[PDB]
RNA sequence: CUGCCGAAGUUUCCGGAUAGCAGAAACUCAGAUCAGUUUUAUGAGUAUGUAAAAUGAGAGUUUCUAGUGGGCCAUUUUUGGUAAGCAGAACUGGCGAUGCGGGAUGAACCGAACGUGAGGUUAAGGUGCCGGAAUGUACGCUC
RNA sequence: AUGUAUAAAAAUAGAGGUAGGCUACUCUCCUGUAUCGUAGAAGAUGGGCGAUGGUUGAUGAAACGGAAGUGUUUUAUUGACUUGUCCAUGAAAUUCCAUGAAUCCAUUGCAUACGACUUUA
């Protein structure tokens, strides 16, 4: 929450989005369009990054078919370090590599995604125009 | 400390009522910063939550939440009507509510 | 006093769809209504109530009941446009107007801008 | 509080007889 | 919102009166239905023409020919009071005949507490010459150097931080 | 009944009569005390010349009952400061 | 009426400042400060002319314009010529003894109607009392404020009042004889 | 618009009922309200009329233990608290909790003289009364019906105004230095396009 | 215990019958009859009575069997009046068998007529606070 | 609680200044939609460049605050952080919302229906 993210493509229902992982460390994710604030920030190129590999099945979680879960070794498993194959870091690093020159060229883009959005005193969302 | 509060501050005014008959199913919520029914249209359908604290540690946490949704404006002053999953207690009149920014349509 | 409801005085509309628009009182209808006109085409000559406008310090030399064309000619000759802007009141209103149509990315740039502005806090001891 | 010496608001029996007083005035004018 | 309506009407043609006289009235009403009702009321009270025997031959709203020219309107009315028989003459300065009548109705209901049905407007005229003006407050309006500070200014956001300027 | 200025009609909460009002403070007068504490021993009667001008018994002897209170000197053991407040 | 105004020409008087409606009229004779907050009137100062202006005022408030005008003119007269009141003692049998203290701001009256009570009156500020030798049993009250001088005369007269006696036959008292200016 | 957890209201120049009506609703909304300078409140109507109103209020008494009768409070803050209390459901537990969130005082005591004091435009006498309308001050009304601390509040307020003025001069002098050094930084004109 | 139907609230003759209102049973009737209604026409004195289109509804009888036969309030006409009240009729209304919203509170005032619920919208009355809802807009008057 | 951020005074038919000698100047007001503050794995790890400041934690202080002063400064250190301007790592699979005295027992009688009260021990 509060992280600023770049939209890669529109899925069937969600949006495949990811902040440049070298900027804000937000992996590729499906995000429902009802939990997104579209800003008037300048558009970042996306034609240079290939998105067909980003499918609902690709993001899908392995089915369990059972209520079983909840174990210490289970939580020691998964984790950002492992249980995700090296191709996942590979394609994202390709994404950041394709995305970084675009954000670098136009000023303030890197710091903007580094910062996290939040409301302050005297902020009224219905009157502010993102 | 200015890096959070993605919600809007609100207050539980009272229940939807006549002079003598109260209808606890829907509550009247004053979203602060909203001063007309036109501005209340922005907050229609947003998710409002009532956050309170309890002695028992349910789920290892002492913080409980009652969810709800803004339905329609109430009057000309910018107050709205909200329906919660559990009808809010009458002791929460004048208490603080949290209006989320989702489901977003901006 | 410094503001008198008189023919030729420039007013700023505060209520109605023309809020923020500049006008000049062409005639005094009565104690509670006046006829105004503006050189701008989007602002039509109309009768408005004093409660909807604020009397500005600017007064132009304009004959009573001048038509729209004469009012525009007098307005351009006496350069009331940029005469109102010369006041700090207009600059504040425009600065307020510019700020409200700002967006999130501009607001982010502003905080960096004003914090670079603040980083000095250098005053001679 | 009110500074009056009488309650400006009367009793329901008092207002009821006032409508009867209004009835008397109609009787005085129309028939009597 | 009152509207000025030209209502022309006449009794239904008959053998005795194959060409009935057409009577026209300029009368103000919120809508055409009220105007035609008021027209019938005046016609009955003057010519004794029954509503059933008559018919409305034309109804037309009349806009102000010069809504952007400030004028002075003098109105003669038959005020209905406790005694129910009084004649008054008033003068209002504005840019529209409808506005003057609206001000007339508001003024009479304010000062004399007279309702719409009790009041009947007898005639409305436009006093173009300054000299025929009979009212001092109107004459003070027609002075050439009219200038005065704005009166009755008075000016959610409760709890203002500073005090109001309530001045220039 | 008697005077209503004394209607509480209850036992006094205090054995020693508390002073409720002190004489108004004046800066012009130099520093002095205003009260003392004694013990009622008893009374007797005395004969005193009546130097009362205009009285029927001017320049004459009168018998007056007079109360005697023993007042050994008091020891000033402390001081208290009082601040004026809107309360 | 939309506009009702009164115009006043100020004299050599030094300052006629009306800051916060407070008229601090300073003249060669002296200075008087008075308050005009009781009236909602515009005091516009221009050169040697002062305008009291009321816009859209009613008859009740418009009556205050002239009253404000008069008190301004009266106090201006005070700072320039001032006011002197001549009060002549009137007695039939018992002489009225008047004593002046601290240059006359307090007047002590004794032996009125034979009474043994000393009637002490303190005059209002800016009023000095003197006994003129030109005319016997004559008291002169000179000052800057016409309000203060006339009030002082009224207080002295009311103190020396005849009670329970036929005023037709008992003429005893002190009464004001002339009301004028020092120059 | 927006709330504050604690709100200090400068009652000077306000109207009794208009300020009380706003305050009572705010208390019910769950806000904590501190009203300072309750002796400077104003009431529409001339003093003698308002004095007679208070005298009529004092007249309410029983024939059995006037202690059982209404307790008439003369302090200006207590007069304001009475106005607020009649606008709350005080016989009800909700109204009782509303009252405990109100703190009306005379003058500005130390814990609040160093805090910001907002005003209520809906209750300001200048914005609500036609000029030339008679009005009275609660401090004068209180002091004439039994309040005996008008002078002490007056003296204490004069000292506070002196100390407050001295603080302002230091703040104003400081603000001028930042104001002078503000345009020294070029960035203020470099990107003033954003309206700042 | 639940459900369904559901009055009369008073004529007309000597406390009873007749009738009225409510049901049941058994019939005939839909190219038929009705109506707390309005037109049209006729006369007669804006009303009246008589007869013949509009609108609505399936419209009729027979037997026999319950309960009811008060009052109160209000409008209008009229009869007298009287310090002034009011008194006498007629008239149809409202209550009465009936909760509910409003009128601070209420047998007669304003709305509204009721299975259990969700949503929406209103009547009457309201929108400073108690109290849900504009310390709304515009024009005046009043201290 | 989610920035728990903001202390002139008075007037409203006027104020506040700046610049001047209570009087001559001009400027500002027309609410806070302001000002302060706000980038960082709830905020990680290092490296520069440029300030020579800012924000504080713990000590040591001296001046100030009495209306309810329980807080204001000035600081002398020490320990941190600094985003003022640039860089380089890390972030994830949580792979679409959920968060020491007093009392009784005694004593007194200045007190007393009984308690209480005043004493003494």
PDB file of N, CA, C and O in Angstrom, chain G residues 8-32:
ATOM      1  N   UNK G   8     -18.646  69.990   8.667  1.00  0.00           N
ATOM      2  CA  UNK G   8     -18.147  70.899   9.696  1.00  0.00           C
ATOM      3  C   UNK G   8     -16.806  71.469   9.280  1.00  0.00           C
ATOM      4  O   UNK G   8     -15.939  70.751   8.784  1.00  0.00           O
ATOM      5  N   UNK G   9     -16.636  72.770   9.493  1.00  0.00           N
ATOM      6  CA  UNK G   9     -15.368  73.448   9.234  1.00  0.00           C
ATOM      7  C   UNK G   9     -14.602  73.554  10.551  1.00  0.00           C
ATOM      8  O   UNK G   9     -15.107  74.105  11.526  1.00  0.00           O
ATOM      9  N   UNK G  10     -13.402  72.984  10.592  1.00  0.00           N
ATOM     10  CA  UNK G  10     -12.607  73.020  11.817  1.00  0.00           C
ATOM     11  C   UNK G  10     -11.786  74.296  11.886  1.00  0.00           C
ATOM     12  O   UNK G  10     -11.369  74.825  10.856  1.00  0.00           O
ATOM     13  N   UNK G  11     -11.545  74.799  13.104  1.00  0.00           N
ATOM     14  CA  UNK G  11     -10.818  76.060  13.255  1.00  0.00           C
ATOM     15  C   UNK G  11      -9.323  75.859  13.412  1.00  0.00           C
ATOM     16  O   UNK G  11      -8.803  74.800  13.058  1.00  0.00           O
ATOM     17  N   UNK G  12      -8.640  76.864  13.945  1.00  0.00           N
ATOM     18  CA  UNK G  12      -7.199  76.773  14.144  1.00  0.00           C
ATOM     19  C   UNK G  12      -6.828  75.589  15.021  1.00  0.00           C
ATOM     20  O   UNK G  12      -5.651  75.249  15.140  1.00  0.00           O
ATOM     21  N   UNK G  13      -7.823  74.964  15.640  1.00  0.00           N
ATOM     22  CA  UNK G  13      -7.560  73.812  16.489  1.00  0.00           C
ATOM     23  C   UNK G  13      -6.539  72.868  15.890  1.00  0.00           C
ATOM     24  O   UNK G  13      -6.598  72.554  14.699  1.00  0.00           O
ATOM     25  N   UNK G  14      -5.594  72.415  16.712  1.00  0.00           N
ATOM     26  CA  UNK G  14      -4.412  71.736  16.186  1.00  0.00           C
ATOM     27  C   UNK G  14      -4.792  70.406  15.544  1.00  0.00           C
ATOM     28  O   UNK G  14      -4.622  70.205  14.336  1.00  0.00           O
ATOM     29  N   UNK G  15      -5.314  69.480  16.343  1.00  0.00           N
ATOM     30  CA  UNK G  15      -5.590  68.125  15.888  1.00  0.00           C
ATOM     31  C   UNK G  15      -7.028  67.761  16.219  1.00  0.00           C
ATOM     32  O   UNK G  15      -7.509  68.038  17.320  1.00  0.00           O
ATOM     33  N   UNK G  16      -7.713  67.146  15.255  1.00  0.00           N
ATOM     34  CA  UNK G  16      -9.105  66.743  15.421  1.00  0.00           C
ATOM     35  C   UNK G  16      -9.208  65.254  15.101  1.00  0.00           C
ATOM     36  O   UNK G  16     -10.227  64.785  14.582  1.00  0.00           O
ATOM     37  N   UNK G  17      -8.142  64.507  15.396  1.00  0.00           N
ATOM     38  CA  UNK G  17      -8.046  63.101  15.011  1.00  0.00           C
ATOM     39  C   UNK G  17      -9.221  62.304  15.576  1.00  0.00           C
ATOM     40  O   UNK G  17      -9.632  62.495  16.724  1.00  0.00           O
ATOM     41  N   UNK G  18      -9.750  61.392  14.756  1.00  0.00           N
ATOM     42  CA  UNK G  18     -10.941  60.618  15.094  1.00  0.00           C
ATOM     43  C   UNK G  18     -10.591  59.132  15.098  1.00  0.00           C
ATOM     44  O   UNK G  18     -11.416  58.289  14.729  1.00  0.00           O
ATOM     45  N   UNK G  19      -9.356  58.801  15.474  1.00  0.00           N
ATOM     46  CA  UNK G  19      -8.923  57.407  15.480  1.00  0.00           C
ATOM     47  C   UNK G  19      -9.839  56.557  16.352  1.00  0.00           C
ATOM     48  O   UNK G  19     -10.094  56.888  17.513  1.00  0.00           O
ATOM     49  N   UNK G  20     -10.328  55.451  15.782  1.00  0.00           N
ATOM     50  CA  UNK G  20     -11.261  54.546  16.457  1.00  0.00           C
ATOM     51  C   UNK G  20     -12.475  55.301  16.992  1.00  0.00           C
ATOM     52  O   UNK G  20     -12.962  55.030  18.092  1.00  0.00           O
ATOM     53  N   UNK G  21     -12.951  56.272  16.208  1.00  0.00           N
ATOM     54  CA  UNK G  21     -14.077  57.136  16.557  1.00  0.00           C
ATOM     55  C   UNK G  21     -13.770  58.015  17.766  1.00  0.00           C
ATOM     56  O   UNK G  21     -14.617  58.806  18.188  1.00  0.00           O
ATOM     57  N   UNK G  22     -12.568  57.904  18.320  1.00  0.00           N
ATOM     58  CA  UNK G  22     -12.193  58.694  19.483  1.00  0.00           C
ATOM     59  C   UNK G  22     -11.637  60.033  19.023  1.00  0.00           C
ATOM     60  O   UNK G  22     -10.605  60.088  18.348  1.00  0.00           O
ATOM     61  N   UNK G  23     -12.324  61.109  19.394  1.00  0.00           N
ATOM     62  CA  UNK G  23     -11.975  62.448  18.935  1.00  0.00           C
ATOM     63  C   UNK G  23     -11.024  63.076  19.948  1.00  0.00           C
ATOM     64  O   UNK G  23     -11.432  63.486  21.038  1.00  0.00           O
ATOM     65  N   UNK G  24      -9.742  63.140  19.589  1.00  0.00           N
ATOM     66  CA  UNK G  24      -8.718  63.758  20.429  1.00  0.00           C
ATOM     67  C   UNK G  24      -8.469  65.166  19.900  1.00  0.00           C
ATOM     68  O   UNK G  24      -7.466  65.452  19.246  1.00  0.00           O
ATOM     69  N   UNK G  25      -9.411  66.058  20.193  1.00  0.00           N
ATOM     70  CA  UNK G  25      -9.340  67.432  19.706  1.00  0.00           C
ATOM     71  C   UNK G  25      -8.368  68.204  20.594  1.00  0.00           C
ATOM     72  O   UNK G  25      -8.633  68.425  21.777  1.00  0.00           O
ATOM     73  N   UNK G  26      -7.237  68.607  20.022  1.00  0.00           N
ATOM     74  CA  UNK G  26      -6.218  69.375  20.727  1.00  0.00           C
ATOM     75  C   UNK G  26      -6.245  70.806  20.210  1.00  0.00           C
ATOM     76  O   UNK G  26      -6.178  71.032  18.997  1.00  0.00           O
ATOM     77  N   UNK G  27      -6.338  71.765  21.125  1.00  0.00           N
ATOM     78  CA  UNK G  27      -6.389  73.158  20.757  1.00  0.00           C
ATOM     79  C   UNK G  27      -5.397  73.996  21.535  1.00  0.00           C
ATOM     80  O   UNK G  27      -4.675  73.498  22.404  1.00  0.00           O
ATOM     81  N   UNK G  28      -5.336  75.293  21.221  1.00  0.00           N
ATOM     82  CA  UNK G  28      -4.422  76.177  21.966  1.00  0.00           C
ATOM     83  C   UNK G  28      -4.715  76.220  23.455  1.00  0.00           C
ATOM     84  O   UNK G  28      -3.784  76.317  24.264  1.00  0.00           O
ATOM     85  N   UNK G  29      -5.990  76.150  23.842  1.00  0.00           N
ATOM     86  CA  UNK G  29      -6.330  76.151  25.261  1.00  0.00           C
ATOM     87  C   UNK G  29      -5.987  74.816  25.915  1.00  0.00           C
ATOM     88  O   UNK G  29      -5.468  74.786  27.036  1.00  0.00           O
ATOM     89  N   UNK G  30      -6.258  73.708  25.234  1.00  0.00           N
ATOM     90  CA  UNK G  30      -5.994  72.405  25.807  1.00  0.00           C
ATOM     91  C   UNK G  30      -6.473  71.292  24.895  1.00  0.00           C
ATOM     92  O   UNK G  30      -6.802  71.516  23.728  1.00  0.00           O
ATOM     93  N   UNK G  31      -6.497  70.083  25.455  1.00  0.00           N
ATOM     94  CA  UNK G  31      -6.849  68.868  24.730  1.00  0.00           C
ATOM     95  C   UNK G  31      -7.983  68.142  25.443  1.00  0.00           C
ATOM     96  O   UNK G  31      -7.938  67.964  26.664  1.00  0.00           O
ATOM     97  N   UNK G  32      -8.997  67.733  24.679  1.00  0.00           N
ATOM     98  CA  UNK G  32     -10.062  66.858  25.163  1.00  0.00           C
ATOM     99  C   UNK G  32     -10.137  65.618  24.287  1.00  0.00           C
ATOM    100  O   UNK G  32     -10.124  65.718  23.055  1.00  0.00           O
TER     101      UNK G  32
END
